[model samples]
Target: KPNILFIITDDHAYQTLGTGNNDSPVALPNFNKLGRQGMVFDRSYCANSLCGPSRACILTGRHSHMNGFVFNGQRPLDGSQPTYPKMLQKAGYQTGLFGKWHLESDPTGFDTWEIFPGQGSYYNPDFISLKPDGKRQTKRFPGYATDVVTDKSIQWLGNRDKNKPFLLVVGHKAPHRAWCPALRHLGKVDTSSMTPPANFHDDYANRPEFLKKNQQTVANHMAIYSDLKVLKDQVPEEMRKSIVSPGYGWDLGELNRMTPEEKKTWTDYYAKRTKSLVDGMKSGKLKDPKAFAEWKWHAYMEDYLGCLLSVDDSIGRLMEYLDKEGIAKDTLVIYCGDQGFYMGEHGMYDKRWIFEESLRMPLIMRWPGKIPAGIRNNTMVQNIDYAPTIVSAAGADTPENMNTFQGVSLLPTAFTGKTPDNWRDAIYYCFYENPGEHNAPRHDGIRTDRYTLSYIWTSDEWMLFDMKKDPMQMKNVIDDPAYKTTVEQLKKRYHELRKTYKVPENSPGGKGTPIPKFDASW
Candidate 1:
């Protein structure tokens, strides 16, 4: 069996990688070099875009509902179920997981495992390890979470039993919220070089009423005093200088006492844009009101991408490890984010919606001589498919119970460079959690190669976008006469997927119920 090296980064968007965004200022030489020697997935998506749910889906080859990890704080993976790693281990492949394991369960079926406790802290993270003697121990590693996780993974690899093929998961915790880079990466990119998102000045005019009232976007949602630390009194000393203006590096102490006009000019540009949006609504020029609701989305993306530069550097380091080990050929190296993130595409910051940005994931795979190089595949794929694909590549049979999983293995396409004719026609997405006070409506949808149709159950809203015509998803044409039949057909497929997955349809109330039991013993 060939070794498997899976690398997952937190909150990484497609645009942050060098292969996907050539114009992005952040240099990701490692990722770009990997892309040149492997296959890049252009339309890979996640069953649920949140952290725990997405990770569960990847491990179990099933949707969040099937894996019992529908929401971040509510549900956790059930250790009783057979995970892919267990299947691989049963098939004679040594397995281990290192770094961030957000699921509230023990790392079962692996010979060894180490994980962070609940969205591990960026600095000096606490880790729980499952030792060979069936004992759990807590330890601390000095340095940033990214470097620490990498060091531990490399150490495990170096000390592994070389007689057996191994499967190792190296999960990095950089580029999440608070966006702290390593000491060497600090001050690497200037804020002035950052480009604002296209919809940086959007006004929430025609969007769902929930989005306007919810706290998710940057313009009205990101707390200037808390989250962003824009308030002078709350600004940390080291970060104060890093927060630069469009051109000038204004001192926070000076900006604290600025006049109302000065403050409005510098901070609250949303007011002016909102006023213009209201005028546009009255004039009917902005008939499609959703177009005006993307302002916060843009601002959130600018800062989010700025945070991704650090993650790019970390990816470079991992790639260098692969090269040094001389296992770049036989080992299958997969690079992917937990899920895709919005970069002001729909006036949103975080992922929850069934929209393209939130649903899609960045997926790249490199295996010299086994997979084609520099090829872009637009075929529909999901996080759940990851497990089956890896298992198949390792020449292991997916378990009979695991056969109920929602994804098909992409081993054929990965190795032969051709998707089978019977490949899935569309991808299904469902997000049930409404945590973080975002109150985003629970929704599910189907995205075929040509169109996307989403049903927001909470708001009774139906959105349809013809990918061929509205690739950017600027308009919802669900009610359009021309798409009535298309919507009906796609809705059938959407319902079929839900039925196949056996997901509950009842709306989960605020926060939902917490997991009754959490197993931390692996």
Candidate 2:
């Protein structure tokens, strides 16, 4: 059996990696090298885009509803249920996981595990691990989160049982909310590709009203201190009256947790950088609300892009270790994000939507001399497919009681460079976090190769998009009569998939909701 190395990043956008686009902001040389030597999944996506739901789906190979983790902070993961790590451990493979495991409860299946508590801090983060006396212990490590996690993971790998094949999962907390970069990476990100998205000025036309009041946009909602990293003391009195509010200094709190020398370096760098924004606002150059929002967009990009620099460096370090240890060809390395994130697209900053930007994720796999090299596959795969795929690749059988996966492995497609004949043509997606953060509505939908159909149950609305005609999803064609048949076909498949996945009729977002009128559409 080959060793498996699974690396997952937090809120990483599919468009940020150099391998995915001709013009990308983040310098991911190691990631790009892995893609060129391996296979890149062109159409990979998450079943649910929220961090908690997506992580649960990846662990259990089930949809959010099936896994009972549809919403964040609702409850802890039901660890008694079977997971991929448990199955692989039972198959005689050593299992270890380090870094962010946001599943609420302590991890259950791994022989060795250490996790970050609650979206781990960027500098001097604390790690939670098991003690010898059967108690939980939290230890603070003195370094950047990405580097410390990588160092601990490498240490574990070196001392593992060499006689047994291993499965290691390394999770990173970089590039998430309050995007804080390592001090060394400050002022070093390539912001040339950080321009606002084409739909930066989205008018919310033909969209739901709740979306209009979204609390996560770059324009109005992102907190002055927390999201933008601007300290309260630096804000001008006039600007403070206009922008500052309660709960805005969480990011500043994080900065204060750093060492005094580190804090000075960070504060000094931002003091110079934010001077222009202050002058622009005071001088009326950025008087227009749109102009001010654009300034926030630039600041958001600087921190987000800078945080990723450490992640890229972490990738290089881990890959080099594999090469030096002579295990490069004997290991199957898979890289992906928990879910996709929006970078000023639709003027938003979070990942709670079924929109294309938040729905899609990045998946690249490399197993030297085993899988095809330097190829791209458009097979529509979801996070639910990971458990089955990883276990299948490990030559382990899915136990009868644990055969609750709703996804199929992509090993065949990876080897042949073609989607299997019986492969799925459409994927289902859902977001069930109403009365939650970002003020997003509860919805479920389906995405075929060419179209997308979504049902906003809270507002009793249906949105249909023709991907070929409106790739950016700018227009909703649900009211149009030209695509009547197409709507009927998609709606039928939508309900069929819901039933096939065994979505509980009593599911919170599934029943007793206001149903929209079918316009040959649903």
Candidate 3:
């Protein structure tokens, strides 16, 4: 059986990687190399866009509702569930997980589990670990979180039993909110050097009410003092004379956890850079909305992509490890993001909407000769397929009790690099984080080859888009008389999907049902 390496990061946009888009903001060398060596999925998607729910889907190969984990979770993951780790464990594979296991529960199935308590810190992160003797201990690792997570994963590889097939997941906290990079990569790009999203200054004329009223816009949300790390107190007299910013340092935990030497690294790089932005704003250099948006986008991208650079470095290191250990030919390595992110798209900077930016996920895999090399597959795979495909690779099937698992194995399609004729032509998506952060309305929709149909239940509006006509999703033609027939057909297909997935028309917070079970046979 082949060893498995799953690398996933938080809010990594599909368009931000060289594999997902050629003109990506970050030139991920290692990711590009991996795509050449294996299969690149052009149209992969997440079950849900939120971090916790998306991760639950990835872990169990089951949708959030079926696994009882929905939303940016506050409670623990139901430990007694059908998850990939448990199935892999039963198959005699040594399972190890390292990084941001955001679920409140201690990871249940893995033999070696070390995770961040919540989102985890970027600087000098603390981790909770499940020890070999059945004790769970929390400890702080020195240096950045991304480096620590990968370092710990590599360390485990060294000490773990080499005879057993291994399954390792190295999760990342990078490029997430409060994008903090490793010290070495900090201040790599100045505000003037960043690229803007095509829809940076989007006029929400044709969009829904929620988008028009929200303040998550890049020009509005990304303040130097709040989202970006620019400390007023720490700045020198020259830089601090008139500049005042909101964000103090890194995460509050990160600031306190840092050793004095580590503290110097963050301050020296951040304080000066942050002041540059403030000084620019005050001096009329960034006087207009356009100039200010450009400045914010640059500052945000510099920090975000700097963090991504560290991640790609880790990928390169992991690949070299496989080659050095003589397992490059047999190991199956997969790199995917939690979900797509907004890099100034619609002038916004968060995930959770049902738009193409948040719904798409990057899927790149390498297995030497087992899978085709340099092939792009647009078979419309979902996060649900992760568990089934991995289980199949391990020469096992999903448990009989896992009939509710709503994913199909993609092993056959991946090996041959061909979309089978019976592959799904349309995919269903539902985003349920309502009246919450980001202000993205509750959206349930179905997307076919060239059209999209979405209903915002809270707003009581239907959105229909001809993707070929409006690829940027700038227009809604649901009421257009010309598309009457198109809307009718899409409505029927949407209902069919809703029934097939057993997607309750009135499910709240993604709970299965409130009514007590009644015997259908009776």
Candidate 4:
């Protein structure tokens, strides 16, 4: 019997990983170890860059259009549809799930499941579970959220029926918006050493209309209190009553739930840093807008990486458990993020655009004897391929009714160094969650190995980038004479892809309800 251990997280960026950038301070040693012992992808991307739609895609092995989960956190996932977990359950395999399930509907395929409501709390979260009588009950888990999720996964593995194959999904809700870190990691990150990207001061000149209207840039969008975690006591009394940020990123009640020691560490660590930034602005020393943005960038990334420390620790513990229990060789372990996040890239901090930083997702998988070790795969792949790969690994068919499935298995690429003939050379990209809080226009494009071409449908604008020369995506070369043939070829293929994926003539997208671009308010 073959087992699958699928680990997933929300908004984990590729560039922050040690595998993506060795000089980066976002320490993910366990992820790095996974890269060394397994196969890591350089071109893996999510079907969509938001949480709910991408998770739906991974489960159903189909794009959002077919499953009808295009909105960001608004639309309900169609849980009644066929899923890899349901297939495994039908094949006599035990299924257990834990951590963030942002979908509105209750999980249908899981035999035992514990999921968070909406975004979930960072400290002592409430988990909703299905009872034997077909009702849901809510319970609280003590300790940090990441640790609790891993502990439950290990617990389920211990009690699972050993005779049957199993599939366990451990989803985490760490390092997300508001970027809350555990108490131990509060003072650990030296914020001064955390450098912003070279394009952190991007002006967004000559870009599509949406880039200017978007509300997620660090300059004017990041909340002073919620996102940066600035305490009101650290500022003057009169400034405390400001209308924006009012603890939008973090909840005031969460502070009330912490233990005495935890509260003390959090208050002191944030108070000193908050006061420094406030005083600098008040004293007229941080006059430049870029200087102010630079300060915010460091503080934001500090907490972001601080939260990731626990996620890494949980990964290490899970891997160690598999080794200690002698199940290391019997299981196929996969680590995939729901989507990529923007960490000061292009001076923005959200994932709704078809940009490179938000487009490329990091994926690492290890199967002791099945996959070759320490390999990097550059074949273009999307999250939609997940269901086929996992189901096929467990000796199950891809199901003939799934005619809308857009991907093939990556088992051949992992087992041998060869991808299947006609493996995708270009992955289609679509961002349909538009006119929301960010006001990012709808964009659909095709990303080939060397070039990326995007057409913002609502604005009727187009941008082409030679990824080899313009990796940072600063230049729009669509109007250039040198790349006329390249643009024509890419556009022709893009139209053909729309036909291949059966994107409707007038696909329903845009006019979304205003969901906050950042978890914080400003």
Predicted structure with the largest lDDT when compared to the true one: 2
Higher-TM-score candidate of 2 and 3 = 2
- Cα deviation of 467 in candidate 4 (Å)? 0.4
lDDT of 1 by residue, 308-339 (tens): 65566666776777789787787998989898
> Candidate 2 vs candidate 4: which has greater TM-score?
2
lDDT of 3: 0.78
Rank candidates, TM-score, best first.
2, 4, 3, 1
Which of 1 and 3 is the better model by lDDT? 3
- Candidates' lDDT values, in order? 0.69, 0.82, 0.78, 0.79
For residue 111, model 2's alpha carbon misses the true position, in angstroms, by 0.6
Those runs of model 2 whose alpha carbons end farther than 4 Å from true positions after fitting are 190-193, 245-251, 399-402, 506-522
Number of clashes recorded per candidate: 4, 0, 3, 0
Candidate 2 local lDDT, 397-479, one digit each (tens): 54662476788888888888788999897999888777678877778889899998988865677899898898888788987
Q: Give residue 394's lDDT in candidate 3 (0 to 100).
A: 86
TM-score of each: 0.82, 0.95, 0.91, 0.93
Which candidate number maximizes TM-score? 2
